[PDB]
Structures are given as C-alpha cells and as structure tokens.
Paper text:
Crystals of the vsTyr core domain belong to the space group C2 containing two monomers per asymmetric unit. Despite reconstitution with CuSO4 after its purification, the initial crystal structure, determined by molecular replacement at 1.43 Å resolution, revealed that the copper sites were only partially occupied. A second dataset was therefore collected from a vsTyr crystal soaked with CuSO4 for 15 min (1.64 Å), resulting in considerably improved metal site occupancy. The vsTyr structure, determined from a crystal presoaked with CuSO4 for 15 min, revealed significantly increased metal site occupancies of 70–85% for site A and >90% for site B, respectively. For vsTyr, the distances of 3.7 Å and 4.0 Å observed in the structures determined from unsoaked and CuSO4-presoaked crystals, respectively, fall within the 3.2–4.0 Å range that is characteristic for the met form. Crystal soaking led to the appearance of anomalous density peaks on the protein surface, but outside the active site, that could be interpreted as additional Cu2+-binding sites. In the vsTyr crystals, this last site is located directly adjacent to the same site found in a neighboring symmetry mate. These additional binding sites are most likely not of any physiological relevance, since their affinities for Cu2+ are expected to be low, and none of them has to date been observed in homologous enzymes. Interestingly, the increased metal site occupancy is the only noticeable difference between the two vsTyr core domain structures reported here. Their superposition results in a very low RMSD of 0.4 Å and identical crystal packing, hinting at the remarkable structural stability of the vsTyr core domain. The final models contain all amino acids of the crystallized construct, except for the C-terminal two (unsoaked) and three amino acids (soaked) in chains B, respectively.
Numbering used by the authors: 34 to 357
Amino acid sequence: QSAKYHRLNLQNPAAAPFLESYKKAITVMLQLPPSDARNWYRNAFIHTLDCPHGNWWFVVWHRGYTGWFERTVRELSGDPNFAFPYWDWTALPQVPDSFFNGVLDPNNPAFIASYNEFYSQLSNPMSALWNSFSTAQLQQMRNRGFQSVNDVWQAVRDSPMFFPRGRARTLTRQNPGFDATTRRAVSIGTIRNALAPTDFITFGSGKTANHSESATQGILESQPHNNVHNNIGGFMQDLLSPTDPVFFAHHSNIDRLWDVWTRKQQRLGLPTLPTGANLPLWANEPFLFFIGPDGKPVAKNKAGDYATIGDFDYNYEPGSGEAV
Ligand SMILES: [Cu+2]
Ligand SMILES: [Cu+2]
Ligand SMILES: [Cu+2]
Ligand SMILES: [Cu+2]
Ligand SMILES: [Cu+2]
C-alpha cells in the first residue's frame, strides 16, 4: 500500500487543492483542439469506444482508464502531486456540493452546449482517428458493432448520449440526493454484500469472450456503480459519462472498493484474480485505446497490465468498507 500519490476522500480538507487542480485541467482540456487526444471530448470517446459494461473486465478497464486520465490531469493542471479524490457515496449519498462549482459542473458554459456544436467540433477528428486504426483496433470496433465512425454517431444521437446545457445532470445543487433504491445501492450493507464474494468473477461480474459482450453482473457493478450513474442522469446515464467530471470521483471510489476487496482476499489467502484457464483469457484481452499524458497511444494494451495499481503508484485514504 506504499505509493507516491494519494487518492483522498473529496470531503478531506487536504483534497481541496486537488479539486482546484482538477478544475484547472478540465478548463485546459476544454480549450485543447480536438486533434489532441487529451481534449475533454476525445477523452470521453475512449469510454464510448472501448469501455466494458456487464462483464469481468469492468473493474480492470476502469482502473486503466482512470489511472491514465489521472496522469493527464496531473500533467495539464501543472500539479505534480495530483491524484483523483474519491466520492464515498456510502458516506455522502448525494452529488457532492463541491461538484456544482465552476467546471466540475458539466452545465458550465465552458462545456459544449449542443449536439450540433459537439458534432461540428468532433466529427473531423473522430474520422481521422477511425482512419488511423490498426487491424487489431478495427476488430475491436467490429466486436462492438461499429463498421464506421458514423455507427458511433448513430449510437450517440439515438441513445441519446449527449445532453444540452441545463440537462447535463438530472440531480441539482438544490436537490442532489439519491432516490430510495440508489440510497440502498450505496448503503454500508450493500457495500459489505459487494465485498463478501471470495472469487474475482462473483465480485467483478461474469466471464464473456470479449469485453464488448454483456454477461451476468456482480453487486459492485449492478447496484452502487450502475444505480449512481443512472440517478445522476444526463451524461452519467450513458456512454459519454466521462463528459461529467464527477465520473472520475465515482470511479476513484469504485477502484478504492476493488483495492479493499483485493486486500481482504490477500488477508484470507484467497485468489485476487481469475484462476486456471480463466487467468490468460482475462489478462490477454486487448485494451487498444488508452492515451498517455503526452497525448500518445500507451504501450500497455492488455487487461493483465492493469490487474494491480502497479506503475500508477497510488494508495487510498481509507473509506467505507468491511466491518472490522
Ligand atoms: Cu506521499
Ligand atoms: Cu464506464
Ligand atoms: Cu510534464
Ligand atoms: Cu508539461
Ligand atoms: Cu462508471
């Protein structure tokens, strides 16, 4: 658990400068040309293109994506100590009041206001990106049902995934609280249920052949993760969710709950990952779309590279977890 960087509770007074650094980076990334892969919308589209939902690649893909984006925020904030604070929704079952301030709020006029402007600004860059894809990357797009960039845009338009100014979230500063179901989903009882499994698949959601396929889900994915996404509403209810800065605070917390689970398993001398023939099936899954803090494609392009915190070199201030 020794590490250079420290993911703190966003309610920790020592986290406050990191939330100001996050606002500085968001402003930079909204101002970068969408030819730069660290542009705010370019970053969100990595999620649309490659995120697994409803399978055993859930926690590990999100560990990869959050750790790379953490480096990008560190770089573009000029804050060399930056680490993503976590939203402990078990302790704070509401959108944090701090995420309604400045560019932490995706209704802020610094954000693209309309689908029309979004398409205008991102269409040529996303076509250029498509035209650059390797054989391997085009196979990932085929596995996801995308034959061209315009199939991605059809999904963006028809879902819909983009929300205009005033609708970027459903929850508001005045009424930021979760509904009864989502309050239960983030309750200490449900979190303890989420941590109880003693094998990776039951913890982290069901095995599939490729990470664009849907399977049975674990508690961590199906209850606190999914219910929080949908109760926030707007961007957070669909696959351009990382448009909302709170996405990374939500995922800092999910990743903390994984760290809690791994340490619980280690204490009991039980496996922390899939075992036997399942281990290479899981570890060898291609993750081909991550962007480093220099805006270049990353070398670490398989799920197994992200099994541990590893090179990302962060630890957690302890939060809501198992009964001691
Ligand atoms: Cu330190
Ligand atoms: Cu996701
Ligand atoms: Cu630098
Ligand atoms: Cu620099
Ligand atoms: Cu999520």
